[PDB]
Write a protein that binds this ligand. Structure first.
Ligand SMILES: O=P(O)(O)O[C@H]1O[C@H](CO)[C@@H](O)[C@H]1O
Ligand SMILES: O=P(O)(O)O[C@H]1O[C@H](CO)[C@@H](O)[C@H]1O
Ligand SMILES: O=P(O)(O)O[C@H]1O[C@H](CO)[C@@H](O)[C@H]1O
Ligand SMILES: O=P(O)(O)O[C@H]1O[C@H](CO)[C@@H](O)[C@H]1O
Ligand SMILES: O=P(O)(O)O[C@H]1O[C@H](CO)[C@@H](O)[C@H]1O
Ligand SMILES: O=P(O)(O)O[C@H]1O[C@H](CO)[C@@H](O)[C@H]1O
Ligand SMILES: O=c1cc[nH]c(=O)[nH]1
Ligand SMILES: O=c1cc[nH]c(=O)[nH]1
Ligand SMILES: O=c1cc[nH]c(=O)[nH]1
Ligand SMILES: O=c1cc[nH]c(=O)[nH]1
Ligand SMILES: O=c1cc[nH]c(=O)[nH]1
Ligand SMILES: O=c1cc[nH]c(=O)[nH]1
Lengths: 249, 249, 254, 250, 250, 251
């Protein structure tokens, strides 16, 4: 294995454990939670920092928006030695109890996107690794953060989530959205389906937690809908979960 | 709510916790693990016994083979007050490490069947309830049984699994089978996809464990292929998991 | 899996246990009732949801084996019966009327089935029609006429989710179920049941003859319009039609 | 109802019973089997002759190749009063027993085409009317022609049937072809799926019989593969079937 | 390569450039635009005329209605040496600016039909050849005809376009129709999707222009809806485009 | 009214009606050098935006990142801010054997083997490039003297599905479809045009695309000379020249 084309990393540049935010600008924020983390690469939408946690090498690499760029990151990180991943992002609540400021931990994801379909037949479930999921749930409890563990909807079109009525395929998006609501779906985001399915194929462990920035369903009902933007809580949960996974390994 | 057409049960007949084997003949065997279990109903392929565990009312109801009959059981049990379900069945191993005699615990299921598609869009994941899954995993470790926690393939055609080459759609079955193998799938069975998706819709908790009867992949490679038919171990794991869920209620 | 040559894993039958002609109800409890129509029938196997009785009709060996609810269990029955020598099958069940002329008490004979289920898709590409054998269908139609029972020969809708038929509005995929239901109504569909699609398609692949008749238990569409909707539960009439059809097929095969 | 745009026919121009060949040039041939048939219209690929059989008004209208043109014919004939249709065409054998010269009677059809999908969800079976099918089977028996009653494969791409290996989607066509063989499919043609499904929606009776022109599967195995082109036999069976259907309606 | 089964043509009978109308009766009208056109064949719904344009051999062959019959025509013409095709038909407008009498030039087509799916995976775009499309656009401008260059919707069920509400799959047809409207679709017809995709596989150039016969969407909104039937303009544009292509190919 | 865009962090007035869109945010500065007095407008997430002028007209360059999901977001937000003419400038892997490293590919349409476009339009709708933009690109390539190939390009969501399909659980599907693309005259493989073309059809804007061929796996499989390329200057020059004539034609 040599220099990776998209991420510009080589074997030895990253740890076995990696946190993956969508926004490259969030990597520095996350790296602050690691020990002696330095920037290893900044290529395209991929910023990578590597430091340590409990003395073990760990990294944080952005994926950009969408399963296409996210799967490229997992593939190249895996080739360089990574085997445990935790996506840390933002999401829009669906379930009425999921409010801005809360944390969502994905147990699985709705594969309404194309990247996963180029990895596995659609019938295969996008499911998060059990160990990573439990580590996240336990971390949130220990830190005292309100959390929701459940399925999250993934999609390829961000504007299909907030303006489905305008789309040529509005009927499809609207019908499926009601379906997600009737299935107990917690929130909506964009990268977990691709990461979970790719992880199943690559044989690595992957989980995800998110900061709920708001809830459109609560808004439509006129219910109080506080907005949030600071991902610190979600980051703290992911880092504590990593410490747990590292020690258990 | 009154008398259920298919199961012939009514509110009060069953507990909130129900174990669900596929074979009606297995209900009596499972009922022996409960305290003072009595036969409640014997309608069609649905045999139901209700007793107590740790003083809480519990039941066991057969689903028959297939998502169609299994979904009916969950629907009617739910209408009568059931809200926590654990399927206990048999399966065929895929992953080479999954041998006859071992126990498999489904974290999710491949929706290669039609029942779940009449409940949810195919993109939705058939995922087991986190609490039930952890209860099963812990029970298996406590009892010292070799277990495998992962995704199981569900299907509608049993003979499509064992005689794919002869089917008109052999090409599709064989292609998908290789796909399941490359996705770390643990074993193959038939009811979890329907039960998991139906559960997501109904708002109830559902999990599954199975006795591995054999492994066709090991057989195809000329490897050891011990056969097993006694589901006592899978049943013990399910009963202990139920006890845990009852305690943590 | 069965540990013995010829022993069928699920049905627990062996070559010699069943005749070439088999009636297939969904409910295992209905087998005894059907067996009474044969001469000297005896139970040969009772495994899982599969109860099998064998006797004779006009001196020819015949059987009745339950399939349980759904294409998954029904396909297993046909596969294992076929391996034991069966080659002519007639499903006898219950169905819910769709066409407004299909009333409770009437008999429906399936000429084909709507493949809105997954079992048939694991046998054949969805484009292939789930169509009943011509000889069996004609035998059923002629038997109902001879016996004087009002019948309707046409397409039946098959499905995997019973509760999707009666509670579609509640389903996450309600939009799909409701839209397709309107399509079935506009295509002259007679009634709704669950096993014929799987049985007809498997039969086409296995090279055996299969047909189906059903007792109409009611009609939801007539009920929705406020039209008289008499309910029914006794499958005796449907059974009589099936047994008479078997007599016809047995004699014609000679 | 007035003048139909594509067929250029109006109520009264056609009978309740119509035979439908694919080739417009085959209409004159079929018309000879009726009594005092006259040319009614010649529009696009649609030629229509109307005459009588047993004193009842009957017609023959070509459909052209494919479900798109055939469905237009059924829709417009239906609007003008037609309610019983029998397609008479040619087909290529699949089943090894189906040889050139033989007649095939479609009990149903494989919907591997797009026209039917714009009428009904793909799960709906393309199934021929019981009465018409029995009439055809009884006619073939009475006339003494070797016939095969079973499912036929329909398709939209003729060259996908004969040159599948060359197609970009060769893998799909070849795989499905093997599936049709393993399902007992009798032969391959192109219009029945569209006509059967449309008939189910329109509430009319439709059936089909064909002249087997050859069998590629027999040719692939080096078996004797007689070639045929005279649709006379298939036509005689369809006309005899129309005759008994007419008598039964009386 | 010998006699083609369906079109009844053989190498040498047609030029490299072919105009393809849907109606066999329109071939004679189009042939008048060529120099010294001769009737080469009249088989089934396929009428073929061959003459010259600027001294170069060119032909006109009807396709009948639908992708199935049109694909057969392209396949057989191609085997006989044709490599540049221009479909000339009629269409119903969708885009509110597309009025009866106007000319529509297809830059691509919506594959809501089955023929193309037997040639290519549905994801592949039905796109017209750039050179042919530019020749058509420039020709329309030169001749002074109002034209619209864009995507056209293809379908297999003509009656699904005008009577969607009645169809068993009305919900699907209606939803998709609204989608086509929100994607700037110019008009609706039936053969371009099949021809464009088949052309991509066969390695030939294909384009299409149509006479707008009316606009149902304008009518639905109560807007002036002038209707037309004379394809003379659409034919002139295609013939002028052929002259351009012929000269540029030199 | 339209305000600050969440993802791109731009507002009405920040960008011109004409925008060039590379996939790599790092390629924006290089493209901007082709404009007059370009200045950085925003740098948010994978979206870097520069705005300057070309022949007096305001023009911009904004990166899309990899994939239709990020690309569609860029088009949506740029459109809201007033952009109506887009030209993607990227890199691609050749398929047709005549498409080799260094050449320029101009997409006339795209294979929708990705999910973003499906959340915009039914799959039957063609992903087709705007006629004016495509012609402008073709004319520019000829004028500048660069070898170019105008045709259909394959779009996908999984980069590693293109380069190691044999490994994938769905290898059978990827491999079969790849042969189909080869038999349909497909020129090259990339990732964002399908989403951009379809979104443009819906939004009512003009979109085209040109790419630098960086390699050709099919040529390599046959042992043919397979030179690698990475300098996008040529593809950029063609896009800028196309923008220039499009601007002139609109005036
Ligand atoms: O904030 P990140 O980590 O990018 O995640 C969320 O943000 C983007 C949508 O704004 C998508 O990536 C979504 O999943
Ligand atoms: O033994 P059970 O519980 O029936 O489970 C397995 O057994 C049957 C297949 O033999 C299917 O039900 C499968 O899921
Ligand atoms: O009464 P049977 O024979 O079971 O048939 C009908 O009854 C069941 C539904 O209640 C399904 O099997 C349906 O097809
Ligand atoms: O000869 P006809 O009646 O046209 O039928 C067959 O002939 C054509 C194919 O050559 C298709 O129409 C096919 O169904
Ligand atoms: O007039 P033509 O060329 O046949 O084209 C149109 O006419 C027919 C529909 O009336 C279809 O072929 C449609 O595409
Ligand atoms: O180099 P860009 O412009 O990103 O384009 C190509 O590069 C990436 C793949 O390496 C994808 O974006 C593909 O479309
Ligand atoms: O609503 C939201 C919020 C964050 N990310 C999303 O994808 N959707
Ligand atoms: O192989 C097997 C064994 C048990 N149950 C199944 O469904 N498959
Ligand atoms: O309504 C009914 C009645 C019997 N069986 C069914 O499947 N549905
Ligand atoms: O092989 C054949 C012969 C006639 N018609 C067809 O469609 N196929
Ligand atoms: O509306 C129309 C007019 C002509 N051709 C069509 O296909 N549709
Ligand atoms: O092979 C390649 C090269 C560049 N971009 C792609 O998407 N694929």
């Amino acid at each position: 294995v040599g220099l990776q084309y998209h991420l510009q990393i080589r074997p030895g540049d990253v740890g076995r454990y990696v946190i993956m935010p969508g926004d490259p600008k969030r990597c520095a924020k996350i790296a602050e939670h690691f020990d002696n983390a330095v920037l290893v690469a900044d290529s395209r939408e991929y910023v990578t920092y590597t430091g340590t946690l409990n003395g073990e090498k760990v990294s944080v690499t952005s994926t950009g928006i969408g399963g296409p760029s996210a799967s490229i990151a997992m593939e190249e990180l895996k080739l360089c030695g990574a085997d445990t991943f935790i996506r840390v992002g933002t999401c829009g609540g669906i379930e009425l109890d999921v409010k801005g400021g809360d944390i969502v931990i994905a147990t699985g994801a709705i594969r309404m996107e194309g990247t996963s379909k180029e990895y596995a037949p659609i019938e295969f479930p996008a499911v998060a690794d059990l160990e990573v999921t439990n580590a996240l749930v336990n971390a949130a409890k220990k830190l005292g953060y309100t959390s929701h563990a459940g399925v999250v909807q993934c999609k390829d079109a961000f504007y299909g989530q907030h303006e489905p009525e305008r789309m040529p395929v509005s009927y499809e998006l609207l019908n499926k959205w009601e379906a997600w609501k009737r299935l107990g779906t917690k929130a909506s985001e964009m990268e977990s389906a691709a990461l979970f399915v790719a992880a199943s194929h690559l044989g690595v462990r992957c989980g995800s937690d998110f900061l709920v920035v708001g809830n459109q369903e609560r808004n439509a009902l006129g219910m109080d809908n506080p907005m949030a933007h600071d991902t610190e809580a979600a980051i703290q949960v992911a880092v504590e979960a990593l410490r747990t996974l590292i020690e258990n390994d």
